[PDB]
TrEMBL record, chain A:
Signal peptide: none annotated. This is endopeptidase La. It comes from the Bacteria. Belongs to the peptidase S16 family. The chain holds residues 245 to 293 of 719 of the full protein. It comes from Meiothermus taiwanensis.
From TrEMBL, chain B:
It comes from the Bacteria. It comes from Meiothermus taiwanensis. Belongs to the peptidase S16 family. This is endopeptidase La. The chain holds residues 343 to 391 of 719 of the full protein. The gene is lon_2.
Length: 49, 49
């Protein structure tokens, strides 16, 4: 069992409510819109978590 | 690339000066962002007196 694959990933913390969390993304592209999945090559395998 | 450094947006201090023929710009003047970014038009007269 690896903690690196069972540790929740912090996406976004609180914005204190006011002002509301506004994110303008003029570069509307899939990696920046929906996020990205990285790939660390440990021991030679593209092992992700 | 298996991963990529997340480069934070950086304020731009430079002053870009595009150079080109009128034909090289009429194909680039159709973008309103060009007309809003490049306000100063330096035209070279084809003929001097």
């Amino acid at each position: 069992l690896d903690p690196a694959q069972w540790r929740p990933n912090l996406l976004t913390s609180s914005s204190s409510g006011t002002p509301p969390p506004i994110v303008y993304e003029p570069y509307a592209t899939a990696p920046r819109l929906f996020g990205r999945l990285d790939y660390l090559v440990d021991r030679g395998v593209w092992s992700t978590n | 690339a298996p991963a990529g450094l997340e480069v934070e947006p950086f304020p731009i201090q430079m002053q870009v000066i595009l150079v080109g023929t009128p034909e090289a710009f009429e194909g680039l003047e159709e973008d309103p962002a060009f007309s809003e970014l490049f306000r100063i038009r330096a035209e070279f007269s084809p003929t001097l007196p």
